[PDB]
Design a protein around this ligand. Structure first.
Ligand SMILES: [Mg+2]
Ligand SMILES: [Mg+2]
Ligand SMILES: [Zn+2]
Ligand SMILES: [Zn+2]
Ligand SMILES: [Zn+2]
Lengths: 97, 178, 558, 112, 87, 107, 171, 275
DNA sequence: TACCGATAAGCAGACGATCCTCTCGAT
DNA sequence: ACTGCTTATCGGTA
RNA sequence: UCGAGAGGA
């Protein structure tokens, strides 16, 4: 059953952040991807058995992190990548604000 | 997954810097003037083979004191065997690297007794040289000024040939007995 | 999780940086050559090392994927690269490219207006991004020719040098996918009085854009490392792996490829024509007649519903899906998959009213309670409960469908040889059926305000229908005239608490919208309270005691 | 005086049929529309053309258009908004998520 | 920038526990108790972890601290004991 | 301050930005006939000095931009003749609070 | 060479270990992983200095799961070698190709061409030897080597050092 | 459009209404900082009525034979008569009450007294009369210094913003104003004894109960507010039957909202009002 | 007369209740 | 379904 | 699964 926009908006209003996160992830999409700390792109070749985690073009096997994002967001970022747009997923703070 | 201490800034790919060499072109982490857990700008802590030996021994002796606190509620060859026992108490047998390190450190230590090493560090960490050069001079036994300048090429013009010999001759007197 | 443990650390995404792909990095990032435009078969079977799985995203049942294997559900796919025979513009940055062309002057690649102009200094004053460029465009738009010497009143009378070659920049317009320039000159020399017309190819534009100074990026709202104006012209295009454009399983032996798979092949087809046309005997106006087509394919691939004139049909005489149209607003990726999505642990049925139900209570039909599950972790507080439940299986009322071990394994009690057994160790998860007093979210569309989405206490009742208290009719604005309603079962102890501590029906009694309450006594209850509350009627002892007994919290005093 | 007139006009419609919506609600919207300098339209080119993060504005009308301008003008979404967190499938800093909760060793031993 | 925060002295935030704090503290403690965490309050034959989580708040034996973030990034660390439960 | 009766030619408005720090302003007869500030709806606008402004941004933990904004050509802004950076404290009758203090920085 | 590095480590802890003996368990979990571990970035993490006063501060209990993310600020001894660093260790392995020298936890290999021409290998000797005159390199024999190059490899740094230069060779 | 415009908007831990970015929309939510549900439409007795009845019901004059409190109301009613020290405080009381009348009339021009405010004082005194079973026969245990000081001491503890500096302290005083204006209206020394008849026990309880209900009435940092508002205005918009003497034909209903939100160079009915 | 802003005469790119349920036809 | 944004003719400034 | 058409509070 679809938990649309109106459904999301209502849950925001309530303030129930964990339920809204659970319904959008655990109850649906939810995908684990390894991203390059250097770039921010899903260009990491994640070998779980051999541990050859290195991202081709970056040479690093160290600055790599796993992330929990909706599979549709993964597909969104890849669709943007396929359109010469870079949605560099950065795990580090750099502007304070 | 222990990558920390001196982190940032990484702005896309980067050149990688330069190859790690004895021209004091040390790792992008081992800067002459680094940071601290408190926050202050602390100078690089480089230990010689004599310092490092009495540093791990100190930490491990003080480790067993604290490890047995929770349980409630000095001769050449004899140093080898005593440390071997301590390593089995304080740490698990899995840490084979520390066992290889301690065995090496105690057999290659230029200064055994704490008292002498204190004076070695007061003599070296005053010369106005890079901490790595100090850690190398106190580790490697040198008779000639040229011997030191060849083994530690970071020196050359950094120190006077005659003045370096004064230090090298002083170390020979400071030398412990095995 | 995307299944299985990883020695890599999990971290929250703090910020997302945007930019443009450098054709240099796309070539580095790539794992595929993409020489062949054929999808499946060697030609034999299992997809050739050209288009689809050369060293990227796997296909049906095989894990393969660039030695890393992992399998479909874990394989995020791995981008490839297609080297474009001749550089081409990116649909999105068409007007932007034209506006930068009208800004920075050609033949030298330097700004039309410099710091010497008082208005340029006033324009460069804002440290914005696009609003700075808005002023930079309008100023550089006119003043047609490039300069060398310009200041006369900040310096005595003589003008001092600041720029390069003073060539005339032309007026640029859009002839569909391409842009053309109109040079002036004509002052008592050549072309009488009519202007000179030239076709401005990407190759020309790209060279001028490559010679654009580092400080000319920052003035025009461009990045030194993320958005270089050159990257607006594609020289190398990234090829998305199969999770983006899935092949689909059409029986044992067939195909059924994605629209994007056919479109990428259509680009390769047009690229391979030019690949040979440029190499072999070049017939001048024959390369352009196929270059404008490669420009067209690479354009409709990203945006098919393009401005006024062009249109692409896939055959049959119906168009092709574009990446822009794929993630376009209103039930398309952004609005249809991310801001709202279909969810597991949910139910829907026709709703009915009840006087014997509690305000915050909900009537759940058995055929819903038996179908929906809550993962209850094994602790000393339950065990015997969860054990008795496991024994009831997926058919009895308390029951349970699956049992999760210490390791990642589901025990489907419907099947399983150990179904009757199971010792039930601690920390294990038990996917038990919804029981009474279980806090569950209830909702009625359109969900217009804070409520109409309230946490309800479960009461498992017979008959396939959602039972509700009549007094909570108003927040949902729902009559029982064939009205259907949704339900959502929380899977965590935290998310189920987030409902019982904030979203509870009794908690949401007073409306913060109007400052008054949102629930009241309606219909029979309201009609009857008038007929009851009056001096006229009194109730005798026989009916008076039943009246008193019906009140659940009665003091027992007559 | 423009916001005072805006509120009067906004309220007068709520007052026109079926009273009423609490001051705070309209006073919020009115202040949103005016605490910008002038009047801010509740449209695709009104409020949506703001200083806000790319992913937040892309979720309302101008999508691929905003995503392209985000890449072209090298925008950096701060990930402080509701919409960006929903897209990232992370706990939004809304109500329950507006703070972090830790465990204290000093406290833990104290209670035993 | 360089290690912010506000001391446990001089704090402009409400001494009372926000309804969102209660919901999170109760929810998380219940989740932890559900995930076999050691219980600090003397159990009264409670089978439900949220009933226990609520009991944990009554005696104020929860070892949880709330990092209330200010819009500028600076934070005030409030221990569940300090926070008064009116609501 | 300079008061005109009809129209100042844009050329007589070109030498106006010259001569700092002297602030020269233009006002039409018809614009000044009736006082705009005296109107029922318009609240009290109070200018704040560099000493006053710095205290507001420090205590309210604001970073200049985050503060609500006021137009430079605004009738009340030209009435107090303030420049970019100057903040005004707006005191208005509140039908819920009694009175509410607002803040607006000039553009 | 042996450096003192005051680096940290993030450790995620399960809610079942939220008992009074947590600090002791978290301090142990730090030694369990970090102590003995070797990385290209920092080198061989030999010994975590001072068991007392290890900063544990506060561990944020994660969003949807009850686990706590504790950042463990510590200080330890590291063995990170360099290409040009002169180190004297003990020969362990010896064959026709060359000999491996155990310098601390790291093994440094010396090729037949990286040592003097006027040396040569002697197979007809137990243990295998490298003779010349009165200088013989066997199963023990302490030597001084100049690291010509460094190799990262897994969680164990290795090196290809030389002994054919002035003031080097056997010691 | 409303809900998307006000997503980011939320009440912060510094009692301010900001958004995602961090820009201030409101310095105090709804200018008073009260959780909309804890509010009831209460009538201000100071603004409404004649100047004669206002002086009659609120003015206490110990230096008068007819305008003083009868010793049947106060325990120390005869020994309070003609006191210079105590009448100074009762002059101080009435001078703030006369300022309240002038200030309230400035805000609420049309004269309307019934305004939505927190803490139902109307019920809190009703509750006290039953909770303590107070009789009209016997006089109060309270003194003038107990009432007037106790009311002003309560006003100090009615916190919205926690301060230290001039701005937050003035923001706190501004945030209350209207509420403590009603508090002076209802807890006036004369009204306390003439109408309510409260003892020292019941009065000290009511002061604590008002304090408690007020601190409960404050906004919770985390309240969505924006989404709440957006849904709260968009919700009645759905049930707008009539889409437009007053004039004959103006623009109201759903199509007016179109104009107000679009912003808005449309004619339709641009009819202005001249006084 | 070399310039400089006026008010038109034109064109364009993206939108418009939330959920739900069913049936028929390929090129 | 709305009010907008991008561009041809034209009086007057010095 | 795509596209049309139908149907509901
Ligand atoms: Mg941004
Ligand atoms: Mg209906
Ligand atoms: Zn990378
Ligand atoms: Zn893969
Ligand atoms: Zn030029």
């Amino acid at each position: 059953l679809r938990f649309g926009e109106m459904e999301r908006d209502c849950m925001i209003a309530h303030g129930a952040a964990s339920f809204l996160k659970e319904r959008l992830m655990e109850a649906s999409d939810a995908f684990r991807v390894h991203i390059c700390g250097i770039c921010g792109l899903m260009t990491v070749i994640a070998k779980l058995n051999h541990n050859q985690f290195e991202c081709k073009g970056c040479d690093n096997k160290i600055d790599i992190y796993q992330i929990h994002i909706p599979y549709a967001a993964k597909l969104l970022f890849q669709e943007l990548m396929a359109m010469n747009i870079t949605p560099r997923l950065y795990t580090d703070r750099s502007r304070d604000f | 997954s222990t990558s920390t201490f001196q982190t940032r800034r990484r702005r896309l790919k980067k050149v990688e810097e330069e190859e790690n060499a004895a021209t004091l072109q040390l790792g992008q982490e081992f800067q002459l003037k680094q940071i601290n857990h408190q926050g202050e700008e602390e100078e690089l802590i480089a230990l010689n083979l004599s310092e490092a030996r009495l540093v791990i021994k100190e930490a491990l002796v003080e480790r067993r004191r604290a490890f047995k606190r929770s349980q409630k509620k000095e001769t050449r060859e004899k140093e080898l065997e005593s440390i071997d026992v301590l390593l089995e108490q304080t740490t698990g047998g899995n840490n084979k690297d520390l066992k290889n390190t301690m065995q090496y450190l105690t057999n290659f230590s230029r200064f055994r007794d704490q008292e002498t090493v204190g004076a070695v560090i007061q003599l070296l960490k005053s010369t106005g040289l890079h901490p790595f050069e100090v850690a190398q001079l106190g580790s490697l036994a040198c008779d000639t000024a040229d011997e030191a300048k060849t083994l530690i090429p970071s020196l050359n013009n950094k120190i006077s040939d005659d003045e370096l010999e004064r230090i090298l001759k002083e170390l020979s007197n400071l030398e412990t007995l095995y | 999780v995307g299944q299985q443990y990883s020695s890599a650390p999990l971290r929250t995404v703090k910020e997302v940086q945007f930019g443009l792909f450098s054709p240099e990095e796309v070539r580095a990032i790539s794992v595929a050559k993409i020489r062949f435009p054929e999808t499946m078969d060697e030609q034999t079977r299992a997809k050739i090392g050209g288009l689809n799985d050369p060293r990227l995203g796997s296909i049906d049942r095989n894990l393969k994927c660039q030695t890393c294997q992992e399998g479909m559900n874990e394989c995020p796919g791995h981008f490839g690269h297609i080297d474009l025979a001749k550089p081409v513009f990116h649909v999105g940055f068409i007007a932007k490219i034209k506006k930068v062309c009208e800004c920075v002057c050609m033949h030298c690649g330097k700004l039309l207006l410099d710091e010497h102009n008082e208005l340029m200094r006033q324009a460069l004053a804002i440290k914005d991004s696009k609003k700075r460029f808005a002023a930079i465009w309008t100023l550089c738009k006119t003043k047609m020719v490039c300069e060398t010497d310009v200041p006369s009143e900040d310096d005595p009378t003589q003008l001092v040098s600041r720029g390069g070659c003073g060539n005339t920049q032309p007026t640029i317009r859009k002839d569909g996918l391409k842009l053309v320039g109109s040079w002036k000159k004509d002052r008592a020399t050549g072309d009488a009085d009519e202007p000179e017309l030239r076709v401005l190819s990407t190759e020309e534009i790209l060279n001028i854009f490559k010679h654009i100074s580092v400080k000319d990026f920052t003035s025009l709202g461009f990045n030194e490392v993320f958005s270089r104006p050159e990257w607006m012209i594609l020289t190398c295009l990234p090829v998305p792996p199969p999770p983006v454009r899935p092949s689909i399983s059409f029986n044992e032996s067939q195909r059924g490829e994605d629209d994007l798979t056919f479109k990428l092949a259509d680009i390769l087809k047009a690229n391979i024509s030019l690949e040979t046309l440029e190499h072999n005997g070049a017939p001048h106006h024959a390369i352009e007649e196929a270059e404008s087509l490669l420009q067209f394919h690479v354009a409709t691939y990203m945006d098919n519903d393009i401005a006024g004139q062009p249109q692409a049909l896939q055959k049959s005489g119906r168009p092709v899906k574009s990446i822009r149209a794929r993630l376009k607003g209103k039930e398309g990726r952004i609005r249809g998959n991310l801001m709202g999505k279909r969810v597991d642990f949910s139910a829907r049925t026709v709703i009915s009213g009840d006087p014997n139900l509690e305000l915050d209570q909900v009537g759940v039909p058995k055929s819903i309670a038996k179908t929906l599950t809550y993962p209850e972790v094994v602790t000393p507080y339950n065990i015997d409960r969860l054990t008795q439940l496991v024994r009831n299986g997926p058919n009895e009322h308390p029951g349970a469908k699956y049992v999760i071990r210490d390791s990642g394994d589901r025990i489907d009690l419907r099947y399983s040889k150990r179904a009757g057994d199971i010792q039930l160790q601690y920390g294990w998860k038990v996917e038990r059926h919804i029981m009474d007093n279980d806090p569950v979210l209830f909702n009625r569309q359109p969900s217009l305000h804070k409520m109409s989405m309230m946490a309800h206490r479960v009461k498992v009742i017979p008959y396939s229908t959602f039972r509700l208290n009549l007094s909570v009719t108003s927040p949902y604005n729902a009559d029982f005239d064939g009205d259907e309603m949704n339900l959502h079962v929380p899977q965590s102890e935290e998310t189920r608490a987030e409902l019982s501590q904030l979203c509870a029906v009794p908690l949401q009694i007073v409306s913060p919208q109007s400052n008054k309450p949102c629930m009241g006594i309606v219909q029979d209850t309201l009609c009857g309270i008038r007929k009851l509350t009056l001096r006229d009627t009194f109730i005798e002892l026989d009916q008076v005691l039943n009246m008193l007994y019906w009140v659940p919290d009665w003091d027992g005093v007559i | 005086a423009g916001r005072a007139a805006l509120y009067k006009e906004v309220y007068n419609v709520i007052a026109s049929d079926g009273s009423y919506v609490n001051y705070r609600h309209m006073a919020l919207l009115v202040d949103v529309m005016t605490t910008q300098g002038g009047l801010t339209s509740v449209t695709r080119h009104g409020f949506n053309r703001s200083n806000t993060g790319a992913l937040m504005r892309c979720s309302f009308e101008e999508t691929v258009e905003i995503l392209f301008e985000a890449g072209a003008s090298a925008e950096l979404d701060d990930c402080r908004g509701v919409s960006e967190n929903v897209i990232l499938g992370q706990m939004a800093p809304i109500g329950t998520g507006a703070f972090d909760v830790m465990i204290d060793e000093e406290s833990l031993v104290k209670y035993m | 920038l360089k290690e912010k925060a506000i001391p446990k002295d001089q704090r402009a935030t409400t001494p009372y526990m926000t309804k969102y704090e209660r919901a999170r503290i109760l929810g998380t403690r219940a989740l932890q108790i559900s995930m076999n965490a050691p219980v600090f309050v003397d159990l009264e034959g409670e089978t439900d972890p949220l009933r226990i989580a609520m009991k944990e708040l009554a005696e104020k034996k929860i070892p949880l601290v709330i990092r209330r973030y200010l819009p500028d990034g600076s934070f005030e660390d409030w221990s569940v004991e300090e926070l008064i439960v009116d609501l | 301050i300079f008061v005109y009766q009809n129209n100042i030619t844009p050329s007589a408005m070109k030498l106006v930005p010259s001569i700092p720090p002297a602030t020269i302003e233009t006002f039409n007869e018809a614009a000044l006939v009736v006082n705009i500030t005296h109107h029922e709806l318009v609240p009290k606008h109070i200018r704040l000095s560099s000493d006053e402004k710095r205290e507001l941004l420090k205590r309210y933990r604001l970073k200049e931009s985050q503060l609500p904004r006021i137009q430079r050509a605004d009738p009340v802004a030209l009435y107090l003749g303030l420049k970019r950076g100057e903040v005004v404290k707006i005191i208005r009758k509140s039908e819920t609070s009694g009175r509410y203090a607002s803040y607006r920085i000039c553009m | 060479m042996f450096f003192i590095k005051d680096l940290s480590l993030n450790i995620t802890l399960h809610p079942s270990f939220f008992g009074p003996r947590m600090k002791q368990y978290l301090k142990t979990k730090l030694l369990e992983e970090v102590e003995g571990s070797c990385t290209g970035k920092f080198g061989y993490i030999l010994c975590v200095l001072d068991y007392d006063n290890i900063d544990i501060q506060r561990g944020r209990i994660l969003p949807t799961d009850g686990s706590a993310e504790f950042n463990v600020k510590y200080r330890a001894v590291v063995f990170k070698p360099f290409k040009g660093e002169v180190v004297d260790g003990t020969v362990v392995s010896c064959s026709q190709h060359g000999f491996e020298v155990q310098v601390g936890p790291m093994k440094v290999f010396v090729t037949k061409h990286l040592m003097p021409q006027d040396l040569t290998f002697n197979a007809g000797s137990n243990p295998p030897s490298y003779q010349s005159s009165e200088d013989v390199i066997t199963i023990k024999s302490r030597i001084r080597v100049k690291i010509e190059g460094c190799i990262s490899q897994v969680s164990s740094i290795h090196a290809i050092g030389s002994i054919k230069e002035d003031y080097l060779g056997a010691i | 459009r409303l809900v998307k415009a006000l997503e980011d908007i939320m009440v912060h831990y510094d009692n301010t209404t900001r958004n995602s970015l961090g820009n201030v929309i409101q310095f105090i939510y709804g200018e008073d900082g009260m959780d909309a549900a804890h509010i009831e439409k209460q009538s201000l007795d100071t603004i409404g009525g004649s100047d004669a009845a206002f002086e009659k019901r609120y003015r206490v004059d110990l230096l008068n034979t007819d305008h003083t409190l009868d010793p049947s109301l106060l325990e120390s009613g005869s020994e309070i008569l003609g006191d210079l020290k105590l009448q100074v405080l009762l002059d101080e009381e009435y001078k703030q009450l006369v300022k309240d009348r002038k200030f309230l009339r400035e805000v609420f021009v049309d004269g309307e007294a019934n305004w939505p405010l927190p803490v139902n004082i109307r019920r809190i005194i009703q509750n006290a009369q039953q909770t303590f079973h107070i009789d009209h026969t016997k006089p109060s245990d309270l003194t003038i210094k107990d009432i007037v000081l106790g009311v002003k001491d309560l006003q100090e503890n009615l916190l919205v913003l926690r301060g230290k500096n001039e701005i937050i302290q003035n923001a706190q005083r501004d945030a209350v104003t209207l509420f403590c204006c009603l508090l002076r209206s209802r807890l006036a020394t004369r009204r306390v004894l003439q109408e309510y008849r409260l003892t020292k026990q019941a009065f000290d309880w009511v002061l604590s109960n008002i304090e408690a209900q007020f601190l409960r009435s404050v906004v919770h940092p985390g309240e969505m507010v924006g989404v709440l508002a957006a849904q709260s205005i968009g919700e009645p918009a759905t049930q707008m039957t009539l889409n437009t003497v007053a004039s004959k034909k103006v623009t109201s209903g759903v199509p007016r909202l179109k104009e107000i939100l679009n912003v808005a160079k449309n004619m339709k009915t641009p009819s202005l009002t001249v006084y």
